[PDB]
């Protein structure tokens, strides 16, 4: 059977974790705000010629439960670090998520991809170069996405799978 990859989508409340995931899985854009408790999805895809099963965990952005992320970070094989390009605090929040995964997994070599979402919106507050500079300093790819237009949606998840394959 095809190889399964456990992907985890993390980031601050409202950055678009669920809209991105639901675009990937269901080809539909969720316009409404339905803040997540915890949801899981499955999709089979072809990446670099190889069929793979994506098992995606869509996590909560609620800061009150930040101490409850340890278990899913232990289980996850790769992480999408999502911020919104029109929300500077969401970009600042990224470093804490990254540090948390590094601490929980006790490793500098965790498959991660930096995702700058809501690229369709005109109210940008985070420079593309700044995100690109941050991803460079982490050693990970950076992908600009729009859950609304689908720009980069497949690329974000596919690139994360490629980061897992190189690690494993």
């Amino acid at each position: 059977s095809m190889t399964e990859y456990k992907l985890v989508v993390v980031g601050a409340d409202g950055v678009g974790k669920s809209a991105l995931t639901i675009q990937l899985i269901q080809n539909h854009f969720v316009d409404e705000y339905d803040p997540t408790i915890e949801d899981s999805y499955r999709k089979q895809v072809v990446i670099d010629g190889e069929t793979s099963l994506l098992d995606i965990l869509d996590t909560a952005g609620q800061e009150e439960y930040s101490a409850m992320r340890d278990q899913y970070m232990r289980t996850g094989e790769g992480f999408l670090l999502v911020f919104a390009i029109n929300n500077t605090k969401s970009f600042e929040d990224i470093h804490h998520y990254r540090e948390q995964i590094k601490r929980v997994k006790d490793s500098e070599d965790v498959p991660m991809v930096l995702v700058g979402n809501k690229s369709d919106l005109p109210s940008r507050t985070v420079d593309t170069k700044q995100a690109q500079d941050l991803a460079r300093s982490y050693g990970i790819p950076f992908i600009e996405t729009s859950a609304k237009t689908r720009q980069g949606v497949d690329d974000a998840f596919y690139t994360l799978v490629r980061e897992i394959r190189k690690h494993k």
């Binding site: 339905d34 408790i37 949801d39 009150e64």
Partner: protein, 163 residues
């Protein structure tokens, strides 16, 4: 005189029982009046026929989205949303009735009924009432919930009003 309201609860259309609530108009009058009027439906809209979309055993039952019926909607009698009135009352244990929200000052019509103490919600959700009769109906709703809140049967407010 703190008003009293009732929900007649049905499970996939089959009667389950009546829950009644005391609304703390003495301490949270604007928030209590919103819930009261939505329970009578006197504004031409309200809770009647809406469902409990999120039930998480060990924690709470949440409902009140009568505009979209998907957990994202609801509206108050004062506009789509209204401000946090006060955080005088705390989430002290089972039966507390409190406002759901999407962050500061975003009360609409969604509410939750605690099935346990939820003290980490103190100061973020406006507590405005308590179950008065029929707490075991709320307990009975829990068996239709799950870890992430998705319900396995349709739990509806078949009827509601003021006592």
């Amino acid at each position: 005189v703190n008003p009293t309201v009732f929900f007649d609860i049905a499970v996939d259309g089959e009667p389950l029982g009546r829950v009644s609530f005391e609304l703390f108009a003495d301490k949270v009058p604007k928030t209590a009046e919103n819930f009261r009027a939505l329970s009578t439906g006197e504004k031409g809209f309200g809770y009647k026929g809406s469902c409990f979309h999120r039930i998480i055993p060990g924690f709470m039952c949440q409902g009140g989205d009568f505009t979209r019926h998907n957990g994202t909607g609801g509206k108050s009698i004062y506009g789509e949303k209204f401000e946090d009135e006060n955080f005088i009352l705390k989430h002290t244990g089972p039966g507390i009735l409190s406002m759901a929200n999407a962050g500061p000052n975003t009360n609409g019509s969604q509410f939750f009924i605690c099935t346990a103490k939820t003290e980490w919600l103190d100061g973020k959700h406006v507590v405005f009432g308590k179950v008065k009769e029929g707490m075991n109906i709320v307990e009975a709703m829990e068996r239709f919930g799950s870890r992430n809140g998705k319900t396995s049967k349709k739990i509806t407010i078949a009827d509601c009003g003021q006592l």
